[PDB]
Design a protein around this nucleic acid. Structure first.
Ligand SMILES: [Mg+2]
Ligand SMILES: [Mg+2]
Ligand SMILES: [Zn+2]
Ligand SMILES: [Zn+2]
Ligand SMILES: [Zn+2]
Ligand SMILES: [Zn+2]
Lengths: 162, 162
DNA sequence: TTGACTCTCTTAAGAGAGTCA
DNA sequence: TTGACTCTCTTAAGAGAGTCA
């Protein structure tokens, strides 16, 4: 198995490569009517992506390193968390974009949490709008708001009470 | 079926049958430290479920009616909304449980909205904790809270900024 | 060892359709 | 006509693994 030192070396080479990705400045809602700035390190749209990186899906990538003649491969956003527990409360840990920008690989924009926690950030009011995430959101979730509900609760007769 | 009269007849027979489902009282968090009471009309756990109803998945049912010698079938929670647009902004409309209780078929606990709006209610703080849904939530979402994040944003070197 | 492709899978909110009796 | 089963599919947040040079 890869040693602690070898895993740290993988994380360091990953950081070195991602740090050379184009850095894009994005102005983002924070909640409470305030605006903030996030700096995303964005993987390219097409090959080549960077040393060790390859695309396995439209917005999915993997990182690959060969150590002592053995090929090791990880989901491209999972590498910052290789020294962390990989499950919690019986749920698999997932890489979760605080910036909601899938191409971004900035490890300061990622956290490591259940898929439910991950998804729920899409609707968070944001760090200045009432976020209660213990690992605080960096921005208001892109889907926060009144929604676009087409039809509400209703009955034709009188068979029901709320 | 095709006619408005036929659709109204479908909605009326669906309501009459669902109106005979057992009424189960659920006490629920509203947000803001308050509690409320919902009365869910719950489809039975096993056959027979009621006239026109059949189970197609562990928590999936369909409603079936024969009109003009033709069988017409719908997802069991979609029937209240048969006169509504079936899409919004190019997104499919879905039956959305305000009570977060799949077996419930109370139309006073259902709305008709995109899958994203539907999902997002799982994390809503609720009608007394700051819900901003235009069609208001009936309860705080079951997944609302601080989360259980294992690891937060972090870097080993000095290549990244927020 | 490495790049650039290929494929299918997970989850939990939701769907459509066929086989028998 | 009605009931009680069977199967796979959709979405958008996420994954693992194979082939070839
Ligand atoms: Mg996410
Ligand atoms: Mg729902
Ligand atoms: Zn980012
Ligand atoms: Zn948050
Ligand atoms: Zn209900
Ligand atoms: Zn709400």
């Amino acid at each position: 198995a890869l040693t602690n030192a070898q895993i740290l070396a993988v994380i360091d080479s990953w950081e070195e490569t991602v740090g050379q990705f184009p850095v894009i400045t994005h102005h983002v809602p924070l909640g409470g009517g305030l605006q903030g700035t996030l700096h995303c390190y964005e993987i390219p749209l097409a090959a080549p992506y960077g040393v060790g990186f390859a695309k396995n899906g439209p917005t999915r990538w993997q990182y690959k390193r060969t150590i002592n003649q053995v090929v090791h491969r990880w989901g491209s956003h999972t590498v910052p968390f290789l020294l962390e527990p990989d499950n919690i409360n019986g749920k698999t840990c997932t890489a979760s974009h605080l910036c909601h920008n899938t191409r971004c690989h900035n490890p300061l924009h990622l956290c490591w949490e259940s898929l439910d926690d991950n998804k729920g950030r899409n609707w968070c009011p944001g760090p200045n709008g009432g976020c209660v995430h213990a690992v605080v959101c960096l921005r208001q979730g892109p889907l926060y708001g009144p929604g676009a509900t087409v039809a509400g609760p209703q009955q034709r007769g009188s068979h029901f009470v709320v």
